[PDB]
Design a protein around this ligand. Structure first.
Ligand SMILES: [Cl-]
Ligand code: NA
Length: 447
């Protein structure tokens, strides 16, 4: 699990996992004047890692204003930082720029400016990211198509080197959909994740207010990624505001990976309030958050909802039906496979309500509702403050009954000897007797 937020007053987060045993984290700071960097051996270490300023805006001319959205990459023996910048003489003439370092440690290393990423059309440009598909390097970025009445569209090009595209850009998405064009017509912040023979390119859309959200384009890893018709745009956001979790305008994301290389991690910013006061560029409250990406059975990513602050939620799968997860539906708890509404199946383990070192399981999509029993049947229901509820929603965490080493089992606090178990797919608390009952009452957290 992670503890959110990772970093206050840090927007447009980018985390790179290097081969040297470190994660590197850069981001947009509210001053918009410089490029910070911090490293840690773990993703959670990043919360306390000290920032170093690797580069500061120029006093005059290009790269002199609006230092926005850096990414750090290690490529062909060297470090590259991609950022966007305006000029002192013109603060909205935002272009894409590249830094290069040959030093082993990018925190202490020395940086050379590779200048502007050239593009045939000279217009508003930012959010350059780079990725390799099938051994071929690409750049994707946000830029104004002057023949469109909007802010930015999405472009992709192959690269000749880390700071230079080859051939011509293809525009692969423009903001047309109702949810893309709130306040401003925007497609920005592209980020690529590849999985199961597919390439997913999430992007940010609408204004950076509560209306900020993620769209997604999908393609085949075998497709020509410069042919616009290779890509399919998702009709609805893949990640948006959750009032229920107090998370507003989630977006400008990137992707990294868990400590074991096994889990994909979504990195992004949001706000914990809806309406900004003052000039939105000047509101510094955007913060950096982490949560695991889960993969759907059809191999698409499932981002769920942006989760409540504090520790991240978990999913529990059945011992005897390892495809099936504890989830709620019409607030009844059950086990089910291939959960489309991902958050119906996330719960965080918290200090038990009833006390004495027990545990409770809070719903991720309905904070302050808990898995609790009533008449021995298990539901998800609002903590009403009563002692009854405290007791129906607390369990003693036991070693799994069919798996003592790695499994987990939930013994009722107010009905000791009754365990959480599935029967006919529905969750109950019932006494456990047969070997099969012991499997019905064993579960795995995060496998
Ligand atoms: Cl579902
Ligand atoms: Na980015």
């Amino acid at each position: 699990t992670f503890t959110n937020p990772l970093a206050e007053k840090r927007a447009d987060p980018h985390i790179f996992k290097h081969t040297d045993g470190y994660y590197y984290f850069t981001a947009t700071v509210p001053e918009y004047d410089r490029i910070v960097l911090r490293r840690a051996t773990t993703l959670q270490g990043l919360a306390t890692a000290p920032e170093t300023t690797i580069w500061t805006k120029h006093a005059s001319g290009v790269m002199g204003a609006h230092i926005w959205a850096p990414e750090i990459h290690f490529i062909d023996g060297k470090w590259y930082v991609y950022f966007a910048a305006g000029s002192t003489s013109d603060v909205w003439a935002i272009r894409m720029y590249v830094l290069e370092s040959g030093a082993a440690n990018p925190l202490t290393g020395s940086w050379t400016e590779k200048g502007q990423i050239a593009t045939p059309v000279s217009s508003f440009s930012l959010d350059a990211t780079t990725f390799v598909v099938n051994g071929v390097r690409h750049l994707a970025w946000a830029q104004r198509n002057p023949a469109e009445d909007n802010n930015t569209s999405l472009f992709i090009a192959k690269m000749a080197n880390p700071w230079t595209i080859s051939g011509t850009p293809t525009e692969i998405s423009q903001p047309t959909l109702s949810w893309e064009t709130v306040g401003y017509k925007v497609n920005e912040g592209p980020a690529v994740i590849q999985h199961g023979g597919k390439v997913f390119l999430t992007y940010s859309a609408s204004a950076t207010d509560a209306n900020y959200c993620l769209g997604m384009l999908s393609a085949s890893a075998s497709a020509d990624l410069l042919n616009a018709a290779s890509w399919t745009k998702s009709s609805q956001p893949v990640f948006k505001t959750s009032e229920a979790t107090g998370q507003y305008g989630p977006g400008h994301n990137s992707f990294t990976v868990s400590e074991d290389g096994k889990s994909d991690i979504l990195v992004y910013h949001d706000r914990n309030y809806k309406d900004i006061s003052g000039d939105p560029l000047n509101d510094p409250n955007r913060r950096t958050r982490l949560q695991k990406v889960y993969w759907n059975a059809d191999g698409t990513p499932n981002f769920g909802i942006p989760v409540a602050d504090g520790v991240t939620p978990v999913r529990f799968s059945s011992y005897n039906y390892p495809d099936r997860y504890i989830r709620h539906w019409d607030f009844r708890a059950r086990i089910e496979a291939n959960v489309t509404n991902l958050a119906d199946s996330q719960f965080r383990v918290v200090t038990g309500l009833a006390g004495s070192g027990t545990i409770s399981l809070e719903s991720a999509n309905y904070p302050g509702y808990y898995l609790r029993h009533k008449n021995y049947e298990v539901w998800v229901e609002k903590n009403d403050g009563s002692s009854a509820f405290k007791n129906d929603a607390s369990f003693s965490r036991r070693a799994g009954l069919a798996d003592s080493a790695d499994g987990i089992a939930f013994e009722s606090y107010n009905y000791p000897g009754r365990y959480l178990r599935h029967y006919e797919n529905l969750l109950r608390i019932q006494p456990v007797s047969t070997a099969l009952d012991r499997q019905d009452a064993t579960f795995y957290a995060e496998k």
